[PDB]
Design a protein around this ligand. Sequence first.
Ligand SMILES: Cc1cc2nc3c(=O)[nH]c(=O)nc-3n(C[C@H](O)[C@H](O)[C@H](O)COP(=O)(O)O)c2cc1C
Ligand SMILES: Cc1cc2nc3c(=O)[nH]c(=O)nc-3n(C[C@H](O)[C@H](O)[C@H](O)COP(=O)(O)O)c2cc1C
Ligand SMILES: Nc1ncnc2c1ncn2[C@@H]1O[C@H](COP(=O)(O)OP(=O)(O)OP(=O)(O)O)[C@@H](O)[C@H]1O
Ligand SMILES: Nc1ncnc2c1ncn2[C@@H]1O[C@H](COP(=O)(O)OP(=O)(O)O)[C@@H](O)[C@H]1O
Ligand SMILES: [Cl-]
Ligand SMILES: [Mg+2]
Ligand SMILES: [Mg+2]
Ligand SMILES: [Mg+2]
Ligand SMILES: [Zn+2]
Ligand SMILES: [Zn+2]
Ligand SMILES: [Zn+2]
Lengths: 265, 265, 396, 20, 284, 282, 284
Amino acid sequence: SKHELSLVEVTHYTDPEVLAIVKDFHVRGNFASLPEFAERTFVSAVPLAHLEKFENKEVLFRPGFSSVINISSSHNFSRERLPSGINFCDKNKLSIRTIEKLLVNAFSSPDPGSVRRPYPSGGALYPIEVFLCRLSENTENWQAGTNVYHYLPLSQALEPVATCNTQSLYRSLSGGDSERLGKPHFALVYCIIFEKALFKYRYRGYRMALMETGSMYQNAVLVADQIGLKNRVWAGYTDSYVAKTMNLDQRTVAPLIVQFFGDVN
Amino acid sequence: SKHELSLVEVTHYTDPEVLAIVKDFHVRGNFASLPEFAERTFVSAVPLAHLEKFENKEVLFRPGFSSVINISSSHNFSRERLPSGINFCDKNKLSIRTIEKLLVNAFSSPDPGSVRRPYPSGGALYPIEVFLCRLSENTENWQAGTNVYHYLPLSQALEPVATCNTQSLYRSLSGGDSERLGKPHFALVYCIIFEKALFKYRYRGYRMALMETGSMYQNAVLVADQIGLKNRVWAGYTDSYVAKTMNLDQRTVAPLIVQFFGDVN
Amino acid sequence: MINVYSNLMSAWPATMAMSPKLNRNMPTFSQIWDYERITPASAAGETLKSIQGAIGEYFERRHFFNEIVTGGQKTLYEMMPPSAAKAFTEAFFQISSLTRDEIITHKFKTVRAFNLFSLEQQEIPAVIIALDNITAADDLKFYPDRDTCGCSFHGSLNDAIEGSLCEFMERQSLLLYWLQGKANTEISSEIVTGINHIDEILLALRSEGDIRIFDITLPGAPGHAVLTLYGTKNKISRIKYSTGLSYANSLKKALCKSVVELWQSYICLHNFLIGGYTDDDIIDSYQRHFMSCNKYESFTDLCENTVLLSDDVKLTLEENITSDTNLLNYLQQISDNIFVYYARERVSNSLVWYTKIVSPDFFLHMNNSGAININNKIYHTGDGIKVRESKMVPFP
Amino acid sequence: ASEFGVVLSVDALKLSRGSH
Amino acid sequence: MINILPFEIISRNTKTLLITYISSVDITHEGMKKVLESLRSKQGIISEYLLDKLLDESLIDKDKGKEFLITTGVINKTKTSPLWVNSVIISDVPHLFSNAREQWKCDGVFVSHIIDIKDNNINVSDSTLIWLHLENYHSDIVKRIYSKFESNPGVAFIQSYYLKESFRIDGVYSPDLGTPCHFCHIERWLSREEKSFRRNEMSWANLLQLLKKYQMTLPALALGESERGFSYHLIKRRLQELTGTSLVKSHVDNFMSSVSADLITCILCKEPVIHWQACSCLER
Amino acid sequence: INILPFEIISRNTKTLLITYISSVDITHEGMKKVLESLRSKQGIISEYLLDKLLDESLIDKDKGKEFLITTGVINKTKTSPLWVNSVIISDVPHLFSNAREQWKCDGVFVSHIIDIKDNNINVSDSTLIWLHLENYHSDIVKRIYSKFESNPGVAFIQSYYLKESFRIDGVYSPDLGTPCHFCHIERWLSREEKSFRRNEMSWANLLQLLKKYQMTLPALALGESERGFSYHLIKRRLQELTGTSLVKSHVDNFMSSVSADLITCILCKEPVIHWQACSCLE
Amino acid sequence: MINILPFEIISRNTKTLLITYISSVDITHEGMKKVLESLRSKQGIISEYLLDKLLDESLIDKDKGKEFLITTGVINKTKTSPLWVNSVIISDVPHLFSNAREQWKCDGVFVSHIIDIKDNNINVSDSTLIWLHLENYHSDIVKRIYSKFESNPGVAFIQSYYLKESFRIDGVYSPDLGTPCHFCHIERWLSREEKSFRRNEMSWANLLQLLKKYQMTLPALALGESERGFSYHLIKRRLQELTGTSLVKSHVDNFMSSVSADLITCILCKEPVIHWQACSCLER
Ligand SMILES: Cc1cc2nc3c(=O)[nH]c(=O)nc-3n(C[C@H](O)[C@H](O)[C@H](O)COP(=O)(O)O)c2cc1C
Ligand SMILES: Cc1cc2nc3c(=O)[nH]c(=O)nc-3n(C[C@H](O)[C@H](O)[C@H](O)COP(=O)(O)O)c2cc1C
Ligand SMILES: Nc1ncnc2c1ncn2[C@@H]1O[C@H](COP(=O)(O)OP(=O)(O)OP(=O)(O)O)[C@@H](O)[C@H]1O
Ligand SMILES: Nc1ncnc2c1ncn2[C@@H]1O[C@H](COP(=O)(O)OP(=O)(O)O)[C@@H](O)[C@H]1O
Ligand SMILES: [Cl-]
Ligand SMILES: [Mg+2]
Ligand SMILES: [Mg+2]
Ligand SMILES: [Mg+2]
Ligand SMILES: [Zn+2]
Ligand SMILES: [Zn+2]
Ligand SMILES: [Zn+2]
């Protein structure tokens, strides 16, 4: 609002060829993930029974050889990352103060006068937008009836987005795997604004934008661990349906990744 | 070596259509960034003089409106991220112990028996590889003559990669903007193994891999700040030239992003 | 999006773009920038309408500001039938300080027109139509103040006329409202339209500030001229006032275009102001004037001074017995002297059309702070608010 | 202005040609 | 929901063989032979009660019988309530579909009505997938249908039509799910067909054409009985993928995408289309 | 017969016909019935159906037709190719010394290469005149137009240089009523001259000062390679305009310019439209 | 390095005009007129000493003169040492290039030699960009050149040749930089040309062909003088982009990419090609 940018300024530099080729590509990665499609679709090209062989492994630069410089673990001063929460449980009320703690710590400076975020960004352009989705009636709310919000990291404020109910929003974000997921209190959805990702650096901007998304949800992971929230980054959603439900215009902006938050009993 | 995975297992599931379409796309984002091309190429579609208007801004969901739920900064318990270092200075010797501290904290568990990394990953497949590049003769080294290494996050060990000299490796990573960059002690290069990103989830895997890259370099940012290293994530490099110099085979693996580390006088 | 760019030596403008937006329930804005050949054309609403409207406004404005050529040079009584030449003479005799003898003997630059009612072919003075200072340079002493009221572009002659006629109605209605402060009705500020993007705007404006919706249609006239007004006292809002206006047979249609045009003006100015852009960026004095009206006092001045013919506030958008009646019948009852300037150009296997509807029996332009035929068949000096006869309405 | 002539025309776009 | 899968059960002299997509068995049991002939007779779905009845009739244990029928590939058990409860086909060539309702039951597809586009007062219940298939293309036909039915709770649409030497099946158009409509599709193909050497379709020639009322026909080669036959099979299999007996699961990244076929070469191309920038379907 | 775009507007028993070149009071009921009928028929019609329509509306066939042709409701166009031959008029004719020979095998038939500096240029009926200029002056186009506008079935196309661009104009055909050279450039100059705020460093200033000083606009520093590139573009446009009717070919094949950036070698194909103010519309 | 840009300087009666890509000036000074005629005479690069000499000769201040010449678009100052110090053209049609060395100096391109492919003992210095242009394509010709010169310090190659109705210019092949070679290119185009409706080129038909010695010719339409002319201009401009007087800067994401041209339509397509999976150029 003080640091507002109009997308009209941005589009003055858009190469329409670039935008079309990037969106054509991007859309190949969209999913049609719904409870009603479970028995006629699949996600994994690898059978369940062969998967473990591929999980948590190292690819070697000289496969079959073992000559390495070992490094001490005595240098590690970190905590182990918590396991990613699954079937969340919404028995406890969850306050707005807890959602607020996450938002300001993961995405904003401690100094509300400063514009320097806790993650870097190609060209300082920050093309990735954070949306808040409230998924539980046991989640406290700022403005009754409003379940989608947009986080403004520089003003440190929430912008109302949608008054969809809590059941519809859970359905869109939770794809066909909702029963395993259980019941999170809330989610963040990270979205790319295509022209903002593309206008300065062209195709390479798409690459920089997706990486930024990762820097962001990672801060959220670390911050969640510290305030005693469980979380799970989530790709099992129908992209367009999420978009639709949040009243995003898919010609301009698209959800890259969902991240779920809550308790685990 | 204990948690080794052979790419032969992976390729048994590769859709060659998917791999071709993803690489065709990916390569559109590669740069030809060299000192010798400075006066006949450009990077920014936006003139220098109009850029500030686009830097550190907020795009609004309701542009022109100001109605928001403000959030307290009293919830923020974090430190402000350091500015990203520029023209690095290699006057000080930098020890292997410092590079080791960064590596184990950003990418490895504190428990060397555990396989659970401090960043999540689609399918626990971890398709992104970390390479270490030594760029200063004032940087200590584990094996004289070896300036490229591959970090094995689960074994917590370095695998020798290349004995290119330090000048050649700096030239490849620093593109045409080396004079502004100055002299970093070392870099990490984050690389995607295409078939490993693609085999399970197909196109959506590419999206998940680039985001993972961001979660990774972000841990490095936070860890660098804590051990008193400066850093700058960097996209101003010639992709194939870096690849070539590090002896990566570009048919299998490609550099997504470089990250520079060192002091700043 | 769109993002069509033309070389500066092209026939076509520098740029056309459709603006990205996050919110799918907000209207599309589309715009064409062509250096300072004209000021940027734009339109807003449903996506394709937006795009058609910006293209259309661009063709319209380029024609009137940059492309007119006169069909030569005649006195008023040569170029048209007598009772029309008289009507023009009386208008011009108010607008400058030259004598009736000077006016009737002056050879005016001419443009093709036809009578709205009889289709009789004639000419009218080019000085009314051309918005550049060269086309009818030698005529400007008779008519120094020109503008785009009643101007319109379309690919059907019928649409071009209908567009010209509706704008004429809305601007005649606006000036009469401005001068007298009389409106037919207020439509509920809390009206629900049923159309997503219209509702979105109204909700955003209601929560940012306050709106008033007024039917200011020329008395007795069919159709609806709907004027929408916003203002806020909110300190961090950069827009303290905006407004929009449209006329149509249909009350709903007029309200919707009215609301969308308010938003269109709201967001253009908002973007100017946050863009950091300077006064040297403003080349159009209507825009300069509108921009100096960006204060709450523009809103309260209209609202406190608005008298309403009907008691209660319209809760629904249902028509009435007047709306249905014949607009040409109504207009001809007031005046025979309404002309349609027209031009046309082949594009592929179609014609595109540029029209302007003009009457010296009505207000010839909308700047009653310039030289204007203040006395005419719908107003005479004294009927209205006096300070307002020498001040321009706060409308862009 | 210069002592060598008077400028008639200019192609503004051609004459023009990390974070800022 | 017991779905009966493709198989045959063949006998000559005293030898009887079952052959399915999954397996082949030398049947050494009269009762199970009878069961299998009865099932081969039925179209598509069968009440688990009928199956038990047919098993008990041949004196065969019910879970042993069932386990046999499932694992050998004769039947399968499905549990999920589907997105569209029902399909209708709307067409300018309804004769081409006059046995479709009957035949496609055996593929597990419920098509409730074949509707001639000429008909007024066309009605469609909630959560119905509308298949609009046109030989003689006009965009006003699609507009009319969207206009009649976009508001129906849970509706979706598929459009099929011909362009040049191709048969086109659009992605599923679902207001609820936010997916691209017909016009998003046909603009993607009219762009590719321009000898432009450019993905980007936009220019002042296009801008000027957009001023006119959106309206069009499509050039395409004349159809024979053979092109119609080919088309009938892709329609059936596409409907089957979405709402019928799944034989081969689709990946989530392609399940709703367009399917295009060259009628010369018979090669399929499955392809997700982006929203067209100048389209209105997102704003509805 | 091609039916051109036009409008008819009615009020009282009054009717006004407007076409691309005319504005006409229609008082004969017969002709209202003929125009209303043609208004809803889109484009190309047969001589037989037109004649049937006229006879129905009690209008002399010969006279009725003369009206429709003269006011620009119809034109009497060929189902066979519009230009049986072509000629190139140039200030650099030597660049085309082998063009006639060579372009044969591309199916392109150029009868004559002609120096613009020749006095007494003649040109056959049904011929397309390619005017190519390295030294552009609008009076050179004016001269060619004046000489040949009246030749049966004549058309014109003009190629020239503007800074880094090679511009090929649309085809100007009096018979078909397509835009001319001046419909582009004079309109372009009008827009510079009548700008809401004149850019005081406009390229119009150069163009207008070259008139005032009686100087041509030179192509900027052409070498062999730019001429080779030009040569090929010319050959390929002529190929596009060969074997062409209004039955074979859409008007947009004529009502299109080709601009080639000689640096990037990128082409830009743009629509060309009429200018109400142009004198090609009489 | 003072680069002389495209301009003209025209006089009639007492009026003299300078016109460049950047600007136009009414020249009101005899000295600067002389300077400008002299520069219009010279090809391409000029010693800053010659420029100063020419300025002093016309009694013009040197920095005022220079500032004028730069800002008006007559010249510019470039500072950078380029990647290839030198270009050679190797061709089966060297006659087509017999004035190229001379002419292209004015475009700031240094081509040291035109080499007939028929010649033995072909020599190329270090840091030379080798342009191989073939009308009569054979892959053995490319193999021979790579074989002779891949090892040369700082070498790069461009290949140009015809395929169907297209003229092809490959991406810059640079062992040092790791960029795709000719064969990476021609496999990308032979894949696209298959009526496959598939990006993926691999099948058992291809596998079997790979057993034979890699060897091929290309089908392409016959060339006239006009196709040759067009080709000459793209070669010059491509060389100019890489090693000559830059007029228009290229984006870093396309600078080294392939350039393809339809000779029918004259439309360019600039496109980065991936490494071919079965290619050896990465392993060298
Ligand atoms: C980009 C991304 C997408 C993911 N998508 C899903 C998902 O769709 N479903 C799920 O259960 N977990 C998902 N995860 C979580 C991973 O499966 C998890 O990080 C991994 O199995 C390791 O487990 P841990 O995080 O508990 O150590 C995702 C993680 C990432 C980084
Ligand atoms: C993906 C990515 C690529 C970047 N590339 C560059 C680069 O090429 N050159 C550079 O100077 N900085 C680069 N940066 C650093 C940003 O310019 C920097 O984060 C931003 O200007 C904000 O400054 P700060 O990080 O000091 O707050 C990059 C950052 C990211 C996230
Ligand atoms: N007197 C007639 N009686 C019956 N049918 C006729 C008559 N004259 C013409 N036709 C029909 O109308 C069609 C149109 O022919 P028309 O005389 O209009 O030539 P055209 O369409 O002007 O073609 P072109 O001049 O290019 O050869 C003919 O093919 C013919 O079948
Ligand atoms: N489909 C169309 N074809 C041609 N011109 C159009 C079309 N739609 C709108 N226009 C023109 O675009 C211009 C702007 O229209 P609009 O924004 O609706 O109203 P306003 O007159 O308030 O600007 C007008 O000249 C209008 O006639
Ligand atoms: Cl209406
Ligand atoms: Mg408008
Ligand atoms: Mg208007
Ligand atoms: Mg208006
Ligand atoms: Zn659509
Ligand atoms: Zn003309
Ligand atoms: Zn290769």
